[PDB]
Structure formats: C-alpha cells, structure tokens
Design a protein around this ligand. Structure first.
Ligand SMILES: *[PH](O)(O)OC[C@H]1O[C@@H](n2cnc3c(N)ncnc32)[C@H](O)[C@@H]1N
Lengths: 182, 49, 85, 136
RNA sequence: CGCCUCCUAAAAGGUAACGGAGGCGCCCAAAGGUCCCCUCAGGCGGGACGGAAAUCCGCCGGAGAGCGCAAGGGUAGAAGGGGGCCUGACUGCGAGGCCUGCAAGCCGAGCAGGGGCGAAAGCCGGGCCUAGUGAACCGGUGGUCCCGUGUGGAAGGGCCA
RNA sequence: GCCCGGAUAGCUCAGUCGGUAGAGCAGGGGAUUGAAAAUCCCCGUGUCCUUGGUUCGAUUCCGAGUCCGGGCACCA
RNA sequence: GCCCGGAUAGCUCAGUCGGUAGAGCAGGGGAUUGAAAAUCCCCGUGUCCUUGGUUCGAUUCCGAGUCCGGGCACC
C-alpha cells in the first residue's frame, strides 16, 4: 500500500525529467505534469435514497475518503424536461498526493481488472490534455465484496493537468500510467 | 383565515407590543423577542394569541 | 323582425395610475437636507457625497449643499451636495 | 401575402417617406406616391410578373405584408374595441425600391411591371441600376 | 366600474377614448439583521448509471441567465448564489422635501432610550424596489388606572394598544 | 363567536361507574359446489387522536391541545 | 357571450384529499351445444390530458396551455 505510494512517487518523479528534456527544452516545467484530481460518479437519480445512496457512501469512502447519505432524486429527472435545483452533487475533489498514490493504485494497479478490461480507447483526454476516461464499471473489489448487488458502476474521474496540448499530455500519462491502444 | 392568521406579541406580564404575522410553515412555534416599554427594552417574549 | 345594430363590447379594461419621480431638483439651486431631489425607480443615480438614497431609490438631500449635478459621465449619473458656503 | 406569426394585433396610421432605393438585379419597380398596399394586390403583381415571364425564371421581392388593417365591425355602428383583424399589407410611401428579377432581358420585363403596378395602386415609376452603392 | 406595470403623455411633468395590452385584493416565520465567502445562462471540447437536457473535467462570455408573484425600472462596481451569528418587521421621534386643492399616500439625515452583525471605519426603526388596500360611525378585547353626574366604590365610562 | 358528540380493527361502530378491547361488514382459508346463493365452520389488525395529573394500576376519570361532526346567534 | 376534462382501462363512467384506480361493458382462453347465442368457470388492462413548480414522494396542490363542453351574439 504505502508501497505503491513510494511507487507513483518515483514513476513520475523520474519519468518527468526523463521525457521532460527528452523533448521539452523549455525549463523542466509542467511540460507536462499532472495536478489534483476530482472524481465524479453516476448521479443521485441513480438513487433508492437510503439504500444505494448509502452504497455510494461505502464506495466514495474506501475509494478515496468521502461516503454518501440519503437524498438522490430532487427536482427529479422526472419526465424529460422536468427538473429543478440540483441536490445531487456527489464527487471527490481531493487535491494532491493522496491523488498520486491514486494515479498509482487506480491506473497502474487496477486498470485491467474485470470483464475484458482491456483498454483500446482513442484520444483519451484530448480535451486539452487534462484527463478523460472514467470506466463504466467499478474496480469491482478495489476493496469490498457484496455490499450491494448492483451497488455501483457509473464511475468516472478527471485530473487537473498542465500537460497542455495533447501529443504532450500523451507523453505524460502515456508512459506515466499507460496509454490504452490506438 | 388562510394559512395567514394574525397574532401579536405581549411580554412577561409587563407589557404587550403587537404586529400580525401568519400561520403557515412552523405554525405555533411562537417565542420570538421584541422589547416592550417595560424597563429599558427587555426580552418581551412575543407569543400572545 | 327588427334590424337595429348588434351587441359588440369586447373589452380592454386597462389602467395605470398617474405617477412622479425623476430629475426633479434644479442646478445649483439652494438644496437642503430633507429636500428631495431626483427619485429613480432604478439606478441612474449613485448617491455621491451628501446624497442620501432613501429606502426606495429616492435621491434625498443629506446636507445643506448647493445643487450638485455630478454626471460622472460614464461611471453613471452621480449626484452630489456641495458644502453650503 | 405573408406577415405570418406576427406578434401583435394592430398598428396605427400616418405616412410620409422612408428608405428604399438600391437595385438588386436590374429589373426594378419603384413606387413613388403611395402608402400601404394590399399584401394581396401585391401578390397580384407577383403573379402578373411570374406569369408574363414565360412562367419560370424567378423574380425577387421588395416590401412585405407588414401591417393589419381593420374595418372592424362588418358595417355596424362604431364603438368596438376597434378589434377585428382583416387586411394585411405593405407600408411603402416615398418612391420605394421594389425589386423584381427573372431574366426577361427587355421591355418584356417592362410590360410585366407595366401591368403589375399600373395595376397595383399608385403613381409610380420603374428602371434599373443607376448609381451603384458602396457598403462596408 | 380599486390598485401596479407598458404604449398613446407628442420627448418636463402630465391628459381622455366602449383606445391597446396585462397582472393583484398572496405573503416570505424566516427571501426580516449584519459579518465572512462565492459569482450567470448559454457556446464549444472531453467524459460513469449518460446518453436532445443531469454529474464532472477542460476552455469561451456589456452579465442576454437572476431577484415568490405581471409589467417596467434597475441592476452580478450582484439587490444575485452559500455559511455564521441575530432581532430595530424597535418605542419616543423627526428637520426638511416627493406629488395633492380636500384627505390621502410617499422620501428621510439626524437627537434619545435599546439593543445586534464586526474588533472595529459603520449597517439595522422588514424585505431589491413601483400593486397584497378601505374614512366615519358602531361595537370587542389586552390596558390604563383619567372621569364618575352629593361621597365612598360602581354600572358605566375618557386616552393607549 | 358561544353551546352540545365523538376520536377504537382497513370500513361503521360497541365499551367496567379504574382490572378484557368487542361486534357487524369488508379481506383471506377449507368443505359444498350443473349452480349461484344461502348455507357451514376459521381467522386477520388495535399508543383505544395527543400531552400530562388521579390511582397499585386507567379504553374509562379530570385539565389541556389538534381535528372532525352537530347545532345556535350575530355581522359595521 | 358563459359552467366545470367536466381527464384516468378499448368504451361509459367512479375513486384520491398526492400514497390508494376502480367498477360495468368489451376482450383473450377453456366449459356446456350438433353449431351459434345465452349461461358457467379462468384471466390481462392503466404517463389518471401536455406542462413546468412545490414536496422526501403529485392522478390528486399551485402556475401556463391544448381539447371537448356549457350563457348570451340577440334590443
Ligand atoms: P329589435 O328586434 O328591433 O332589434 C334591435 C333594435 O332595437 C334598437 N336598439 C338596440 N339596442 C339599442 C340601444 N342600446 N339603444 C337604443 N336602441 C337600441 C335598434 O334601433 C334596433 N332597431
């Protein structure tokens, strides 16, 4: 555990200067590093309120620190254009290091893990070189067992990077955490 | 008569001040505050139906 | 058996009481507090020095000042009262 | 006519001058001493032209079915809310740039207009492109 | 057939019309105080349960989303979105002005007692404002503790709320 | 604004002058069943509206609260 | 110039006040008949008009709208 902690620490610390000058030649800047990572998941309407809301709890929890209560369908998805406020903001905006043992554990230690979990995804982030890819099925047992039949699945996170333009960002998490195929 | 009924404040037997008010949401719950001409300001209380 | 006109009173019962407000206090004129100046049901007016904006967007004289017309050009309209004399 | 999906019921009345002039193809019909002109009458001309022109190669446009004219009642006595919508049309008054093409190549177009408007409803004149025009 | 808003009042203001249009005769116990923070819709690009439209990431933007309620004014230099603590939505009152012939209705610095938000420079005598309104009589109730038809009291009654 | 009644099983309603909660119907279960019934047995649920005091205890007794039902009287 | 979707199952209409949807008729499948009716058993059915808003939850409560209705159109 703190094992893979020291791990990401190194992966990146070195890889960084590595490609850093390999191609950069700017001034070893965020050319192209990664900072803070928010994570978001399958909106409250995915609710049952008490039940799967508390499950969202368990999960958000053991995953990175924060676990769901009972309120996930207000101003309701209702019928099509039928919705009011937005009291279903269930996400983790944790900011740094924790995040890195995470890049670790998460990408590099749980990446392929369950049903054909391959990863042959085109322009992963591409929306400015900052993230993109959230997976559509939990890291199954990134911990816990049957603590809810359907429990959870709509999973998707995002990193705040500086890997500016893509090709660059690409160098970045490509060698840093694995670039899923063509 | 509607969820709008009129009450008014009176204070610990040493005065009474007035003002209307309502019925709706927290209904009865009626302490409040206000200050009578009793002494110089003073709690008052409110309630009084 | 009786062709005389025909009913026809569709109806537009519309009405708006008369009103007031506005640019109502002349340049320089002797302007004392309590004396109201320019009422605005908006914000064409920023209560500059000694200009008191009443609980209604009503420009009222806060001090014994000579009618101070301070259009602060673009910032907007700024009203001011000048230190008597 | 066309003054579709309006927004209000009625206008009012006045007249005096405006802003029609240019060219837009070189087959032009310009008003001169009018006012409003029936969207219909209008279509009239439209027809006149369209038909004359060996019945095909398109003309263009000009004014619009603009306002809603009301004679209100039907013939009653007067005091209705002045309601009633009824005849819709153009509001062009100082010799206006009325623009109609086709590819007549000639006094043929001429005729087309000739009747169209001779018809329509006023003292008016016609021509082509006479002093271009420069915009930004 | 009372009131608010817009047009026509034609540029001060301000005016009919069986002239156009269109709302209100609620409340909001906390949209009432103040202190501290925040800051739109929508366009685009990238994304779990999506999947025209949530939720999150990445840019873009006289602010056209927003402010119970209609319009209009305003206005995110927020009146707007969030948190803390609290009653002044105080009595005594006001000088001096808006409009108005009548009565109306309406604007308000500042002095007093008295508190509440900051440590304080100060804001708070309801709300973001322009409609939610009604004389006079008559009578009720909570005072008060002024009057009483010889005097003591009292039916009853004067002013306050 | 007074003056009476109630608040109980899902429904409609009994109920010691303080010791148990009960009908009738609905609902469900078997026998019967050309057959529909009627018959025929069997069950199901209760802060007895709420809050306190009386009593060893209280559906009950008393005060108070909310609600519904009744009635009777005015209204500038 | 009116009165209420005056709505909800295929139809005619109950029921809610926001938790509950129902009934009759129709209909689908067996049974009786030689075969159809009738009759006898079995069964399934609902964006409670669209619409935003409130609420933890709306067929039901507000706000807007569509439709079908009802009072005059004539002194
Ligand atoms: P009737 O059957 O004759 O039809 C209408 C006639 O009555 C007279 N009339 C109608 N309405 C009137 C008003 N408001 N004022 C005066 N006379 C009115 C008409 O003359 C008509 N002929």
């Amino acid at each position: 555990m703190p094992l893979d902690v020291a791990l990401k620490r190194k992966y990146y610390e070195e890889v960084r200067p590595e490609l850093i000058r390999r191609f950069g030649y700017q001034n070893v800047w965020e050319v192209p590093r990664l900072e803070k990572v928010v994570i978001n998941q399958g909106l409250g309407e995915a609710k049952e309120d008490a039940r799967i809301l508390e499950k969202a709890a368990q999960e958000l929890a053991l995953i990175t620190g924060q676990k769901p209560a009972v309120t996930r369908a207000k101003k309701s998805i209702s019928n099509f254009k039928l919705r009011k406020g937005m009291p279903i903001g269930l996400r983790v905006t944790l900011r740094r290091d924790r995040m890195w043992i995470f890049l670790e554990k998460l990408l590099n230690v749980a990446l392929p893990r369950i049903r054909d979990f391959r990863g042959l995804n085109p322009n992963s982030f591409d929306g400015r070189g900052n993230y993109n890819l959230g997976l559509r099925e939990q890291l199954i047992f990134p911990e816990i067992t049957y603590d809810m039949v359907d429990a959870l699945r709509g999973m998707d996170i995002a990193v705040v990077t500086t890997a500016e333009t893509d090709e660059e960002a690409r160098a970045l998490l490509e060698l840093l955490g694995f670039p899923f195929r063509k | 008569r509607i969820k709008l009924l009129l009450e008014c404040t009176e204070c610990k037997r040493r005065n009474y001040a007035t003002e209307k008010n309502k019925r709706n949401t927290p209904n009865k719950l009626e302490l409040r505050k206000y200050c009578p001409w009793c002494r110089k300001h003073t709690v008052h209380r409110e309630v009084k139906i | 058996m009786a062709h005389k006109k025909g009913l026809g009173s569709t109806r537009n019962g519309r009405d708006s009481q008369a009103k007031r407000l506005g640019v109502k206090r002349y340049e320089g004129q002797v302007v004392r507090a309590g004396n109201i100046l320019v009422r605005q049901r908006g914000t064409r007016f920023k209560p500059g020095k000694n200009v008191g904006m009443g609980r209604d967007f009503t420009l009222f004289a806060l001090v014994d000042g000579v009618v101070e017309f301070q259009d602060r050009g673009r910032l907007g309209r700024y009203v001011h009262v000048r230190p008597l004399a | 006519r066309m003054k579709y999906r309006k927004q209000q019921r009625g206008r009012l009345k006045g007249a005096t001058k405006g802003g029609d002039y240019v060219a837009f193809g070189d087959y032009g019909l310009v008003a001169l001493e009018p006012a409003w002109i029936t969207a219909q009458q209008i279509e009239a001309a439209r027809v006149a032209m369209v038909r004359h022109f060996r019945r095909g190669g398109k003309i263009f446009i000009r004014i619009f079915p603009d306002k809603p004219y009301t004679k209100k009642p039907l013939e009653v006595r007067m005091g209705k809310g002045k309601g009633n919508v009824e005849g819709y049309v153009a509001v062009v008054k100082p010799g206006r740039v009325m623009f109609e093409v086709a590819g007549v190549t000639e006094e043929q177009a001429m005729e087309a207009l000739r009747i169209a408007g001779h018809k329509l409803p006023i003292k008016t004149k016609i021509v082509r492109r006479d002093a271009y025009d420069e915009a930004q």
